[PDB]
């Protein structure tokens, strides 16, 4: 419905918004990121390793979504 079988996006904004809605970081997760970061700056491989439900790509995304705020 929002993405066809062949990858044609019927509603690209909905697809994009979906990726933001999945900004479900808990405070334990948030706090672990920070401590692992300042210890190992931008070593997202290492950071992701200490996060049970966060992959290295989600860590990259979180970094950019928050590093101003």
């Amino acid at each position: 419905k929002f993405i066809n079988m062949n990858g044609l996006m019927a509603d690209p904004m909905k697809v994009y918004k979906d990726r933001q809605v999945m900004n479900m970081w808990s405070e334990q997760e948030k706090e672990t990121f920070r401590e692992k970061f300042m210890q190992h700056p931008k070593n997202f491989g290492l950071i992701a390793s200490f996060l049970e439900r966060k992959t290295v790509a989600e860590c990259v995304l979180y970094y950019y979504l928050t590093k101003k705020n």
Partner: protein
């Protein structure tokens, strides 16, 4: 009128080359963010893109090179010392998590664009994630691992007798030029900073092709600080005559934003408007068009450049004011589409130099009638 295909991969930006490395894949995420919030998708057919396999990649690259890109990881590098050196990985081209996925993702979109142009699914295909023009047959180079451009042009050559490649990145497009140096079926035109060992150190005006490809390769070497007006004064005449003489049935345009003023690596003084004037001029010829990204190392300016170029390609005048989004703060303090990116540094391209340049280019062009 014109059907515009746009490849939007929500995942292609979620990679990081390493601390200190100027290449930021997340510049693609900012670009998409702005493109969507401006409503430009309403004028385009937007695809979640195909991902390229080793099979696709090895239509140009060597089997062992691609094998190495799959195998090497941040945690196993110690055992790959000789391979890193042989394949030129570890310096400009570091090992980072997700390296192969990123290559597959950007290459796939270039190939799908080529495919859709071949099939006449569209008139213009856009992949801002692609345009990694430095990568060679069996070595990484200049932040580029897989040469998605060459892979894409190979695909175009199935149907197109003559492909014009135009490269606007500040760096010489050496990887593409090398792959096609000996053939007249692809004409490579590159405008770039040349001199004083500025990377990659090639793209001398005397590099014109060899064998049946002699005079089907064109290099325009420039000095520091070229501005809009001077660039336009070369670009438009050169391209116009290239199109007339060569008669391409398809154009591939690499739009590296590192030719903008205030780029982290580049030393040119083009405005976003000036850079967009090149894209719009290529569009005016009404020849099937594959549009790729490339360099661009001031993230905030890169995203805006490619957003503005999207609006041109789609013939939509968007507001100078950036719409609010998750990345709004990246555009401080101006929050504008067209910030001042002037270097305010002296242009090193004297009128004499440019005419000396002009005259050798048109002499070379004479060879194609």
């Amino acid at each position: 009128a014109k059907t515009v295909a746009y490849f939007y991969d929500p995942d292609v930006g979620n990679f990081h080359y390493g601390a200190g490395h100027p290449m930021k894949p997340h510049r693609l995420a900012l670009t998409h963010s702005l493109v969507l919030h401006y409503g430009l998708y309403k004028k385009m057919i937007v695809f979640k893109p195909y991902q390229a396999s080793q099979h696709d990649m090895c239509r140009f690259h060597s089997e062992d090179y691609i094998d190495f890109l799959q195998r090497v990881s941040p945690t196993n590098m110690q055992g790959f010392t000789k391979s890193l050196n042989a394949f030129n990985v570890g310096d400009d081209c570091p090992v980072f998590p997700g390296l192969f996925e990123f290559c597959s993702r950007y290459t796939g979109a270039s190939l799908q664009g080529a495919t859709q142009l071949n099939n006449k699914i569209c008139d213009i295909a856009i992949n801002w994630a692609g345009g990694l023009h430095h990568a060679k047959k069996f070595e990484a180079s200049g932040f580029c691992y897989v040469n998605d451009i060459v892979i894409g042009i190979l695909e175009l050559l199935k149907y197109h007798p003559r492909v014009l490649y135009i490269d606007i990145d500040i760096h010489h497009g050496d990887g593409v030029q090398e792959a096609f140096y000996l053939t007249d079926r692809v004409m490579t035109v590159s405008f770039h900073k040349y001199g004083n060992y500025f990377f990659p150190g090639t793209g001398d005006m005397y590099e014109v092709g060899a064998e049946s490809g002699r005079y089907y390769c064109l290099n325009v070497p420039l000095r520091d600080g070229i501005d809009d007006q001077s660039y336009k004064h070369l670009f438009q005449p050169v391209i116009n005559q290239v199109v007339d003489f060569y008669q391409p049935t398809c154009i591939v345009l690499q739009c590296g934003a590192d030719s903008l003023g205030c780029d982290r690596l580049g030393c040119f003084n083009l405005s976003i408007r000036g850079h967009g004037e090149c894209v719009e001029y290529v569009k005016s010829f009404n020849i099937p068009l594959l549009v790729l990204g490339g360099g661009g190392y001031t993230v905030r300016n890169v995203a805006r450049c490619w957003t503005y170029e999207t609006s041109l390609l789609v013939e939509e005048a968007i507001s100078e004011e950036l719409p609010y989004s998750e990345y709004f703060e990246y555009f401080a303090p101006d929050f504008t589409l067209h910030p001042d990116v002037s270097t305010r540094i002296e242009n090193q391209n004297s009128r004499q130099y440019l005419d000396q340049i002009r005259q050798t280019i048109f002499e070379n062009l004479k060879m194609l009638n």
